[PDB]
Design a protein around this ligand. Structure first.
Ligand SMILES: Cc1cc2c(cc1N)n(C)c(=O)n2C
Ligand SMILES: [Cl-]
Ligand SMILES: [Cl-]
Ligand SMILES: [Cl-]
Ligand SMILES: [Cl-]
Length: 130
C-alpha cells in the first residue's frame, strides 16, 4: 500500500541519517570504503561477505533494508569482519578491533535512543506480511 511505502521510505531516511553520522566519524574512516584488493589482496579470499558503510548506503537506496534489524545485521558484519580479519595482539589489529566495536556500539546506541520501537514493530509486520 502507499501507507506501507511511506513507512519504508521513512525507514530509509532514518537509516541514511544514522549511516552518515557513522561515516563522518574520524574513528570509522577505515570502514567507509570497501577494502581495496590492491592494498589487501587476500582480503576477498578470507572475508566471505565484505561490508562497509558506502555499501550500506548503496543497499539503503536499493531498498534492501525493510527493518532496522536487516540494517544492524550489516553493521554487525562490518564489525565481525574486522574482528575476524585482524585478530592479533599487535597494536594495528587492536586499534581496528577497538574501532570496529565502537562502530557497532555507536550504531546500536543511536538506534536505542532514536528509533521508536513501535515504528520498528510496524516495519517488521509489513515485512512479514510479504
Ligand atoms: C587499508 C585497509 C585495511 C583494512 C581495512 C580497511 C583499509 N582501508 N579493514 C576494514 C580491514 O579489516 N583491513 C585489514
Ligand atoms: Cl589512523
Ligand atoms: Cl542481498
Ligand atoms: Cl583483546
Ligand atoms: Cl524512527
Amino acid at each position: 500500500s502507499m501507507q506501507e511505502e511511506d513507512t519504508f521510505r521513512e525507514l530509509r531516511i532514518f537509516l541514511r541519517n544514522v549511516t552518515h553520522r557513522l561515516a563522518i566519524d574520524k574513528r570509522f574512516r577505515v570502514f567507509t570504503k570497501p577494502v581495496d584488493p590492491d592494498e589487501v589482496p587476500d582480503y576477498v579470499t578470507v572475508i566471505k561477505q565484505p561490508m562497509d558503510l558506502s555499501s550500506v548506503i548503496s543497499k539503503i537506496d536499493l531498498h534492501k533494508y525493510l527493518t532496522v534489524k536487516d540494517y544492524l545485521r550489516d553493521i554487525d558484519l562490518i564489525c565481525s569482519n574486522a574482528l575476524e580479519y585482524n585478530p592479533d595482539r599487535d597494536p594495528g589489529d587492536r586499534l581496528i578491533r577497538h574501532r570496529a566495536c565502537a562502530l557497532r556500539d555507536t550504531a546500536y546506541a543511536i538506534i536505542k535512543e532514536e528509533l521508536d520501537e513501535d515504528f520498528e514493530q510496524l516495519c517488521e509486520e509489513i515485512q512479514e506480511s510479504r
